[PDB]
Structures are given as structure tokens and as C-alpha cells.
Subunit: 123 residues, 3 copies
């Protein structure tokens, strides 16, 4: 009178949820890659912004043998506020990412055992 | 003849899935923080872009006592299309984020009860 | 002596986990939208960066009837390294996104059946 057939569905449902959760983890990494990759583009953009500051007034003088160059910063470089927080942001993802992988490894081991134990009841 | 030992594994597996799902929620917030933080950097960059437009032709005149300044916009400011949609994007995350927290609270309460009920069967 | 009441809680817990997982999927898409949307802003910014390069030295000449224009690139355009990888990044999300939707459809069908089967035991 045991409802093993129902348990087989429940145990299987956990496996499907586990697969999606695992997929979310891989997908989550991609989101981090795009967000983080954009930051690399931003650093490249900051350089170009600075190059402009170099452009100020060239040839702006026909009676003087001099050129005035005023490289006033143009890129707001983030050294402490965002860089320090960004490192924390990436670090945190690492700790949670590692936590998730650890839990997934346990879930996979445990998910298999629940299915293995079920087979024994009706092997 | 009840398979409580199997249920203990199944109930535990749900707890581990719940922990990972919860972790995804915290991790999801970090992804939103980095994406959103980049937008703040973009707003800072837009300002610098505008400063350039101010730079056009300085000292480009040695027989005139005047300076020509042409601040042609350089930053594409998003006032309606992206700003309005971005607010919706952030809002939507808020509604889904709140929905997830509400469901997690129920899941935690319910997860505990399922384990508590299991103890009673074999307390 | 069957613990159906416990199963009803376990089966329900899976439904709540499924709802949150599904919510994560919708939320995950928003994160991709913001990250990807920023890239569209970056492409707009690259154009403006180039416009600057056009600005070099105007009117920098009062004894010549000529203007020197030096449009030195200012935007680092990503044609192959990031564009090709970015397409892969978006593609991968598509494959995982489709995988998740497929699994969710099966989970919903299966989740319903587990609940439907439970009703039969005590309908």
C-alpha cells in the first residue's frame, strides 16, 4: 500500500528542479561575465576619454613657436569607492558561487541516493 | 513499513534546494548591483563627454579678441526611452524580488513544518 | 498509516520551489536585458567618441585658408574578440534559457501529476 510510484514522481521532480537550479548557476555566471566584461570596456573607454583631454588647442598659434596642451582628466577613474566595492561584488559572487557548487555537489550525491534507496524498496 | 528514511532524504533535499535557491537570490541581487552600478558610471561618463563638446577651438585666433565655444552635445542622454524602461526594469526586479522573498519565507516555514511533522512520525 | 499529509506538504513545497525557480528565470532575463542594454548604450557612446576625434584644431589658422581635421579613432570598437564572444554569451543564455523553459514545462506537467496522483490516494 506504499505510494512508491508517487515518490518516484516526487524524487524525479527534485532532480528536474536540481537540473534547472544548476542551469541557473551556469546562466548566472554568464550574466556576471557580460556585466564584468562591460567594465573592461569601460576601462578601455576611460583611456580614450583621457586622450581627448590631450586635445585642447593645436596650431592655435601663428606667431608663436609653441603649442598649448591641457590634458584635463576626462575619465572618472574609480580607484577606491567603486573598485573596492567592485572587488567585493566579484568576491561575493565567488563565495556564493562556491557555496552553490558545494550544495549542488551534496544535492547530486543526495539526489542519487534517494533514487538509489527507492530502487531497493522495489528493485 | 513506511519509508521515512527515504522521506528524510527527500525532505532534506528540498532544504538543500531551498538554500541554493535562496543563494541565487542573493547572487541575483549582486548581478543587478553590477549592472546598475555600471549605469551610474555611464552617467558620470556622459558628463565628461559633454565637457569635450565644450572643447572646440581655443586660441584659434591671434587677430581677434574672442574665443569660439561650440558645446555640441556628445553624450546621448536617455530621458524617456531607456530611463523609463530602465525604471521598469528595476521595478520589475523589485516585484519579482519581493515575490521570491515572500515565497522563500513560506517555503522556510513550510520546509520546517515538513521536517517537524516527520519527527513526530518517529520522534 | 500512510503519511499523505506529509506528502501533501512535500509536494506543495516542490510547487513553491518551482514558482521561485520560475521567478528566477524571469528575473534572470531582466538582468540580461540591463547588461545587454548597457552594451547598446556603449555603441551609442562609441559614436560620440569618434565625433571628438573629428575635433582637433579648428580655426587654428589665420593666414591660411585651410582647416586641419584629424579624426584619430577614439572608440575602441570590438569587432571580433568581444563581439564574437558577446554573441556566444547571448547564444549561451538562449540555449540555457530554452533548456530551463523546457525543464520548467516538464516540471509543471510533472508537478501537477504528483498532486493529481495524491488526490486519488485520498480523493
Amino acid at each position: 500500500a506504499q505510494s512508491r510510484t508517487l515518490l518516484a514522481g516526487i524524487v524525479q521532480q527534485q532532480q528536474q528542479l536540481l537540473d534547472v537550479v544548476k542551469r541557473q548557476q551556469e546562466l548566472l555566471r554568464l550574466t556576471v561575465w557580460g556585466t564584468k566584461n562591460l567594465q573592461t570596456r569601460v576601462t578601455a573607454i576611460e583611456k580614450y576619454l583621457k586622450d581627448q583631454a590631450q586635445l585642447n588647442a593645436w596650431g592655435a598659434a601663428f606667431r608663436q613657436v609653441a603649442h598649448t596642451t591641457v590634458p584635463w582628466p576626462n575619465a572618472s577613474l574609480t580607484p577606491k569607492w567603486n573598485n573596492e566595492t567592485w572587488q567585493e561584488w566579484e568576491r561575493k559572487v565567488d563565495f556564493l558561487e562556491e557555496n552553490i557548487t558545494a550544495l549542488l555537489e551534496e544535492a547530486q550525491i543526495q539526489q542519487e541516493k534517494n533514487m538509489y534507496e527507492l530502487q531497493k524498496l522495489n528493485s
